[PDB]
């Protein structure tokens, strides 16, 4: 059947992103703790759009004449902690990294850092984009 096909789609795009290492064990939990019905389209919606928002905060803190490295650091500790919980592990230890550039006051450190943050973040929106398309046409 159509409905059939569509799961198959979903199922294949899963497995490939758990076994290309882009989504964590904390990505199965989120699928556990839907088991209300889009809860998991929802969590993933809120998540690229706040990680997009904390990416561009980010990037301006590093546009200013004087950096404030406490707070770069403070945006990229709640980046890691969103991306822990949807399970976006690359993206999660990027931000890990990302504090030593803080504590070295390196601004082009953490421009080097935010590029690589956005690379995972692109890889993984690209995936759950894909996935919120499908999970559309199977609740439809």
Do not use: W
């Amino acid at each position: 059947s159509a409905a059939a096909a569509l799961r198959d789609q979903l199922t294949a795009l899963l497995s490939s992103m758990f076994s290309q290492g882009l989504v964590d064990e904390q990505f199965q939990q989120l699928q556990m703790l839907q088991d209300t019905p889009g809860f998991v389209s929802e969590v993933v919606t809120l998540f690229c759009d706040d990680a997009d928002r904390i990416i561009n905060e980010i990037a301006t803190l590093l546009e200013q004449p004087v950096v404030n490295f406490d707070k770069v650091d403070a945006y990229v500790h709640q980046l890691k902690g969103s991306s822990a919980s949807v399970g976006a592990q690359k993206v999660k230890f990027t931000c890990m990294q990302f504090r030593q550039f803080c504590q070295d006051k390196s601004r082009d450190g953490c421009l080097m850092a935010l590029a690589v943050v956005r690379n995972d973040f692109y890889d993984l929106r690209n995936k759950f984009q894909t996935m919120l398309q499908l999970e559309q046409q199977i609740q439809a």
